[PDB]
Backbone:
């Protein structure tokens, strides 16, 4: 009963992104990943994932709160669901801002909670 549902993981912890990618693929999602936080907004514009998993603390001084802020202010990208993963200390503050994520999963992330959250936002694919 499979139907295509695409996820992009923006994460420079590539061990974690591999773990999450495998877990999501196990439920039938089509999954890509990138370490390129700087390019991520434009990659989302190009590739049009159905959901993005976005880390807070990215390489090269990139920051998932800033990236999500940009996505949510972009009239053509602000409807893409975003799950932020990271140190949970900042999540409540982010929720109070106008431009914020759709869901949050604390690091250390359990791949099951992340898969659960993705499925609850866009449905499973099969
Ligand atoms: Cl992080």
Residues:
């Amino acid at each position: 009963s499979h139907m295509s549902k695409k996820i992009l993981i923006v994460e420079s912890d590539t061990a974690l992104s591999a773990t999450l990618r495998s877990a999501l693929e196990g439920r039938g999602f089509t999954v890509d990943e990138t370490t390129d936080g700087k390019g991520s907004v434009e990659q989302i514009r190009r590739d049009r994932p159905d959901l993005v998993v976005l880390a807070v603390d990215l390489s090269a001084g990139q920051n998932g709160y800033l990236i999500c802020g940009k996505l949510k202010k972009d009239d053509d990208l602000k409807n893409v669901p975003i799950v932020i993963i990271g140190n949970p200390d900042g999540f409540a503050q982010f929720r109070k801002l106008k431009a914020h994520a759709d869901e949050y999963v604390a690091k250390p992330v359990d791949a099951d909670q992340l898969v659960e959250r993705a499925g609850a936002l866009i449905g499973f694919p099969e």
Notes: The chain has one domain: 1-126. The CA atoms of residues 92 and 104 lie 10 Å apart. Residues 55-57, 86, 107 surround chloride ion (CB under 6 Å). The radius of gyration is 13 Å.
